[PDB]
Write a protein that binds this ligand. Structure first.
Ligand code: MG
Ligand code: MG
Ligand code: MG
Ligand code: MG
Ligand code: MG
Ligand code: MG
Ligand code: MG
Ligand code: MG
Ligand code: MG
Ligand code: MG
Ligand code: MG
Ligand code: MG
Ligand code: MG
Ligand code: MG
Ligand code: MG
Ligand code: MG
Ligand code: MG
Ligand code: MG
Ligand code: MG
Ligand code: MG
Ligand code: MG
Ligand code: MG
Ligand code: MG
Ligand code: MG
Ligand code: MG
Ligand code: MG
Ligand code: MG
Ligand code: MG
Ligand code: MG
Ligand code: MG
Lengths: 71, 116, 206, 86, 96, 23, 137
RNA sequence: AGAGUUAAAUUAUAACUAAGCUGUAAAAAGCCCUAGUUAAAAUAAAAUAACCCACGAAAGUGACUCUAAUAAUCCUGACACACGAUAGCUAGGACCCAAACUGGGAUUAGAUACCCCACUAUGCCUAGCCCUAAACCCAAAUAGUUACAUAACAAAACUAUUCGCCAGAGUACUACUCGCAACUGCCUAAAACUCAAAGGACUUGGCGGUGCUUCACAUCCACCUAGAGGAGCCUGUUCUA
C-alpha cells in the first residue's frame, strides 16, 4: 500500500461524502485495513487527495466495495 | 459477517479490560420480537394548503376553484381506503420475511440449548 | 338488536329488479344473494318504494322530530315545502321573462342545492398535546358534512327565530337565504373556515 | 469551505422529479450514517454515554446478525411437513 | 456428546464414526436380554418420538404382539400410572 | 439494596460538610 | 438512456445545458432548514442575491413557523419572486436537517420553478466546537 | 515527552439582500451592532475508519509528520521510592464554543429545580501543588487443573507459594493523635450511648405518570340525543332545635 497513489486509496471511500468504509464493506485482513486507513489519512493531511468528496477524475474505477447505493 | 466476540466479555480468563457490557446475557431466546406498528403521520397536507390558497386568495367562495376541493375529497377518500386496506395487507404479508407466529413455531421446533 | 348478524338491509328500489337482463355482474350478485339462503330484515316504517319520497327529506324530517311526534315533523316539513313553493310562485309572478326563466320553483332541488352549498368542507377536532387542547383541521366524512349542515339549519331556525314567526316559514326563509348563499348558516360555515385557516399550522399534529 | 463546491453529497434529478432524488440522497446519508450523526450532535454526549451507547449498539448488532443467521439457516424448514398424522 | 467418546472409533472429516465392534458387543447382550424378558412373559414397550418412522415402529409392535408409544408421552404416565391408565395396572417390564 | 448504605453515607457526608461550613 | 447521478464537472467537456446556459451558470437556492425556522434564498451564479423569503416573512409566528406548511408557503413565495426576476432552473442546496426539508423542496417545485440538482451541505464538525448540553438532567 | 503542521466546522471583521433572528409541548424574555450568502486569521476539539481490541504498570491514549522510547535470562513483597481521571489552589498567557454561580423569562400553591436566554470561575498552554473517584471488571500477584462438585444471583468449580485485609449494626469517609507546599483538605482511625438485629440473594402477589401489541362499543376521546346543577313544589339526608 502507499499514500502516493490516490486511486487505490480512493476506491475504499464513499463518493458522495468521503467517508472510509469499514471491514464489513471493504473485506480485508485487519493489517491491510489498518494500512489503508493510515495511508488515506496521511494522504488527507499531506494534501494529495480530497476530503469532502471522491476525486471525480477517478470516479469510474471498478467497484471493489459491496455497498449498493441505488435501489 | 458477525463481529468478533473474543476478549469482549468480563471473565476470569480474560487478561485485557472488558469491552462490551451487556445488560442482559447474550442468549438467543426461542422467540423473536413482534413487529413495530408504524407511527401515523398527517395526510392531504399539500391539497389542504392549496385549498387554503384559494380560500385566502378568493375570500372563501367555493365557486371560484372547485378542482382542488375535488382533489382534497379524492385525497381524503384515498387515505380512508388506504388505511382500510393497508392494515389488513400489512398484517399477513411480510414480503421476503415470515410472520412472527410461524417464526416462534420454527424456533420452538429448533430451540437453543444453554443447558447441558 | 333483535336482528342477528346474518340479517341484511333490504333493497327497496324497484328499477333495480325491473330491468335485470342488461348487465351480468349485478345479476351474479343477486343470485348469490338469494342462493346463499340469507335472511333479510323487515322493511323500515319510514322507507318505502314510493317515487315521491326522498332520503335527505326523510333524514331532515327525522331531525325535525322532537320526542316521538312523526306526524308533527312531517306536517312542519309539508308546510315548509308549501311555503317554499308558494314564495317561489309569488316571486315568479312578479318578474319579467328573463327572471322567470332564471327562477327555479322546485322545492326539492332548492333544498338539495341549499344543503350542497350549506355543508362545510373541512372540520376541526380537539387534540391534547403538552397539557393543552388544540383545534386541528380534519377532512370530514360526507355524512358528517351533511349532518353538520342539517344540524346548523335546525339550530339557527330553532334559536334565533322570534316567538311570533312560525317555524316552517322561518325555515323556508332560511332555505332561500342558503340557496342565494347569503345565509347566517353560510356565514357560520365561513367562520369555521376562518378558524380552520387560523389553525392551518396545527394540521401536522394529526 | 476550501473544497470545490457541488461535488459532494449531490444527486441529480431524472426526467423532472425531485422526490426520488431526495430519497436517493437520504439513502446515501443513511448508509453513510450521517443522519444519526446530525441527530446525536444536536446536543453533547459525555464519553461515558458514548461508550455505553457503542457497547449497546455492538451487542444489539451481534445479537441481530446472529439471529438473522439463524433465520436464514432455518428458512428451508418452513415447508409443509410430509409426515402429518403419522 | 461427552459420554460417546469411548463408544466412538474416531472422526472422519468432522463426522463421528461409531465403533460397530462395540455396537455388536452391546447388541448381542441387548437382543439376548430382550429375548429372555420376552421368554419370561414380560411387557415390552417400544418408544421412538420421531415422526419419520413412527408408523413403522407401530406396525413393528403390532406384528410383535408387544406395545408401542411413539406418540406424545404424557408426563405422569410411567410414574403416576394408576391415575392415567386404570385402577390396577401392571407396569411395563422393558422399554426399547 | 446497597443504595440504602450509599444514601446513608451520602447524608452523613452532606451533614458533615454543612457542619464544616457553618462552624 | 445512460444517466449519471454525478454532476457535470466544470473541467470536463460534458455537454448538458438547461435553457441555454451551462451548469455553473444556473442560480442557487440555499435552504437553511432549522428545527424552528426555514430560510430560503435564491442567489445568482455570481453569488448576487436574487430573492429571499422565510417562514417568519410569510406571516407565520413562533410555533407556526417550525411546521412544514410554513416552509411550503415560503418555497411557493420564493419561487414566485424568483420567477418575477426571471429564472427557470435552479440548483438547490440544503443546510441542516429540519421538518421543512421535503416541504421546502416541493414548495420550490410547485411555486413555478424547476430544480435539476440537490446538494446536502449540512455543517458536520469533525469533533470541532462543543455543542450545548443535553436536556432532562 | 518534546518540536512542527491543519481538513470538517465555528468566529472576530467586511460586501450584497431581507425585516425579522433565537427559543420550545406551548409561550415569554433576549437580540433587532439581527438573519442568509460569499471571503476569512486566532483559540478549542480531533466525523467516518472503529462491526477494530492494540499500547501503557495504573490513571489513560485512536487528526498528521519527525525525534527519543516502552525495566527485569521475567516469583511474592511494604508504612520506602515514583506516578495517579476529573474537580480544586498561586503566578503568567489564551478565550471559538460549552458552562458551576448569578441575573432575567416560563412552570408551580411555593421552584432560590427539571424548560429557554446571556455571562463568570473553569474546561486550553507553560511552571509548581493538591493525591481524591462506583480509581469497579466491586473478582490480588505468580505457577497450574477440568479431577470432586451445582446455597441463590452473577463472570463455571478449583489446587500450590505469598502479601494486604475481615471479629454484629448505627454512632463513623466521625471526635482526639502522627505526618503532608494540603489550614472548609488528605491519610491513619476509636469510644461513650442505643438496638436485637443490621445485612446479601431469591419465591409469589400487589403496584407502576416504564415499554410494546390487541382493545373499550353507551365507553375513554373524537362524536349523537335527552337531562341535572339556575326557578317553584314534593321527598330523603346533613346541620342547628
Ligand atoms: Mg494490559
Ligand atoms: Mg445489569
Ligand atoms: Mg477554516
Ligand atoms: Mg445519619
Ligand atoms: Mg449557553
Ligand atoms: Mg446526574
Ligand atoms: Mg507539552
Ligand atoms: Mg419578545
Ligand atoms: Mg480572537
Ligand atoms: Mg478526527
Ligand atoms: Mg517489559
Ligand atoms: Mg515485586
Ligand atoms: Mg491528580
Ligand atoms: Mg486544572
Ligand atoms: Mg471564560
Ligand atoms: Mg431566576
Ligand atoms: Mg475507570
Ligand atoms: Mg474498594
Ligand atoms: Mg499483590
Ligand atoms: Mg431454583
Ligand atoms: Mg461496634
Ligand atoms: Mg472521601
Ligand atoms: Mg477526617
Ligand atoms: Mg485518639
Ligand atoms: Mg356513558
Ligand atoms: Mg325536565
Ligand atoms: Mg337543569
Ligand atoms: Mg333545581
Ligand atoms: Mg329540600
Ligand atoms: Mg335519620
Amino acid at each position: 500500500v502507499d499514500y502516493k497513489n490516490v486511486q487505490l486509496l480512493s476506491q475504499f471511500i464513499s463518493p458522495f461524502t468521503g467517508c472510509i468504509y469499514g471491514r464489513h464493506i471493504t473485506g480485508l485482513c485487519g493489517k491491510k485495513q489498518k494500512e489503508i486507513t493510515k495511508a488515506i489519512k496521511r494522504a488527507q493531511i499531506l494534501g494529495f487527495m480530497p476530503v469532502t468528496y471522491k476525486d471525480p477524475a477517478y470516479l469510474k474505477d471498478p467497484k471493489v466495495c459491496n455497498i449498493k447505493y441505488r435501489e | 459477517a458477525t463481529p468478533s466476540l473474543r476478549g469482549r466479555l468480563a471473565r476470569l480468563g480474560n487478561p485485557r479490560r472488558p469491552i462490551l457490557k451487556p445488560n442482559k446475557p447474550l442468549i438467543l431466546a426461542n422467540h423473536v420480537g413482534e413487529r413495530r406498528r408504524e407511527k401515523g403521520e398527517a395526510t392531504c397536507i399539500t391539497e389542504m394548503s392549496v385549498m387554503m390558497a384559494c380560500w385566502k386568495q378568493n375570500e372563501f367562495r367555493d365557486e371560484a376553484c372547485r378542482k382542488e376541493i375535488q382533489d382534497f375529497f379524492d385525497c381524503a377518500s384515498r387515505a380512508e381506503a388506504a388505511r382500510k386496506m393497508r392494515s389488513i395487507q400489512e398484517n399477513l404479508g411480510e414480503l421476503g420475511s415470515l410472520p412472527p407466529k410461524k417464526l416462534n413455531k420454527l424456533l420452538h421446533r429448533f430451540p437453543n440449548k444453554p443447558h447441558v | 338488536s333483535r336482528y342477528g348478524p346474518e340479517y341484511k338491509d333490504p333493497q327497496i328500489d324497484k328499477e333495480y329488479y325491473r330491468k335485470p337482463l342488461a348487465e351480468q355482474t349485478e345479476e351474479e350478485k343477486y343470485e348469490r344473494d338469494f342462493k346463499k339462503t340469507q335472511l333479510i330484515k323487515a322493511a323500515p316504517a319510514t322507507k318505502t318504494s314510493s317515487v315521491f319520497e326522498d332520503p335527505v327529506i326523510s333524514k331532515f324530517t327525522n331531525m325535525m322530530m322532537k320526542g316521538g311526534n312523526k306526524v308533527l315533523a312531517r306536517s312542519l316539513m309539508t308546510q315548509t315545502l308549501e311555503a317554499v313553493k308558494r314564495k317561489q310562485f309569488a316571486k315568479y309572478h312578479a318578474a319579467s321573462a328573463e327572471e322567470q326563466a332564471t327562477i327555479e320553483r322546485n322545492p326539492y332541488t332548492i333544498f338539495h342545492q341549499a344543503l350542497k352549498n350549506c355543508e362545510p368542507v373541512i372540520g376541526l377536532v380537539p387534540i391534547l398535546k403538552g397539557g393543552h387542547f388544540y383545534q386541528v383541521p380534519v377532512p370530514l366524512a360526507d355524512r358528517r358534512r351533511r349532518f353538520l349542515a342539517m344540524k346548523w339549519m335546525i339550530a339557527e331556525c330553532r334559536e334565533k327565530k322570534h316567538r311570533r314567526v312560525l317555524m316552517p316559514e322561518k325555515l323556508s326563509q332560511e332555505l332561500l337565504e342558503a340557496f342565494h348563499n347569503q345565509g347566517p348558516v353560510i356565514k357560520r360555515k365561513h367562520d369555521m373556515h376562518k378558524m380552520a385557516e387560523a389553525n392551518r399550522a396545527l394540521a401536522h399534529y394529526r | 469551505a476550501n473544497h470545490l463546491k457541488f461535488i459532494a453529497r449531490t444527486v441529480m434529478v431524472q426526467e423532472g422529479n425531485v422526490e426520488g432524488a431526495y430519497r436517493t440522497l437520504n439513502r446515501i446519508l443513511t448508509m453513510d450514517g450521517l443522519i444519526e450523526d446530525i441527530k446525536r450532535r444536536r446536543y453533547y454526549e459525555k464519553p461515558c454515554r458514548r461508550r455505553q451507547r457503542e457497547s449497546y449498539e455492538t451487542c444489539r448488532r451481534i445479537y441481530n446478525m446472529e439471529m438473522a443467521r439463524k433465520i436464514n439457516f432455518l428458512m428451508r424448514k418452513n415447508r409443509a411437513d410430509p409426515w402429518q398424522g403419522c | 456428546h461427552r459420554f460417546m467418546e469411548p463408544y466412538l472409533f474416531g472422526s472422519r472429516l468432522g463426522q463421528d464414526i461409531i465403533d460397530l465392534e462395540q455396537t455388536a458387543a452391546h447388541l448381542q447382550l441387548a437382543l439376548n436380554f430382550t429375548a429372555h424378558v420376552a421368554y419370561r412373559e414380560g411387557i415390552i414397550l417400544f418408544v421412538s418420538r420421531h415422526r419419520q418412522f413412527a408408523h413403522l415402529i407401530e406396525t413393528t409392535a403390532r406384528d410383535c404382539g408387544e406395545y408401542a408409544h411413539t406418540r406424545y408421552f404424557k408426563g405422569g404416565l410411567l410414574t403416576n400410572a394408576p391415575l392415567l391408565l386404570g385402577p390396577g395396572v401392571r407396569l411395563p417390564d422393558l422399554i426399547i | 439494596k446497597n443504595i440504602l448504605k450509599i444514601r446513608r453515607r451520602k447524608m452523613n457526608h452532606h451533614k458533615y460538610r454543612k457542619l464544616v461550613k457553618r462552624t | 438512456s445512460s444517466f449519471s447521478i454525478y454532476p457535470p464537472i466544470p473541467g470536463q467537456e460534458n455537454s448538458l445545458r438547461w435553457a441555454g446556459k451551462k451548469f455553473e451558470e444556473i442560480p442557487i437556492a440555499h435552504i437553511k432548514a432549522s428545527y424552528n425556522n426555514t430560510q430560503i434564498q435564491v442567489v445568482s451564479a455570481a453569488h448576487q442575491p436574487l430573492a429571499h423569503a422565510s417562514c417568519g416573512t410569510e406571516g407565520f409566528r413562533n410555533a407556526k413557523k417550525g411546521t412544514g406548511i410554513a416552509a411550503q408557503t415560503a418555497g411557493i413565495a420564493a419561487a414566485a419572486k424568483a420567477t418575477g426576476k426571471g429564472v427557470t432552473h435552479v440548483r438547490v442546496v440544503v443546510k441542516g436537517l429540519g421538518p421543512g426539508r421535503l416541504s421546502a423542496i416541493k414548495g420550490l417545485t410547485m411555486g413555478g420553478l424547476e430544480v435539476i440538482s440537490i446538494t446536502d451541505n449540512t455543517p458536520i464538525p469533525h469533533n470541532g466546537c462543543r455543542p450545548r448540553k443535553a436536556r432532562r438532567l
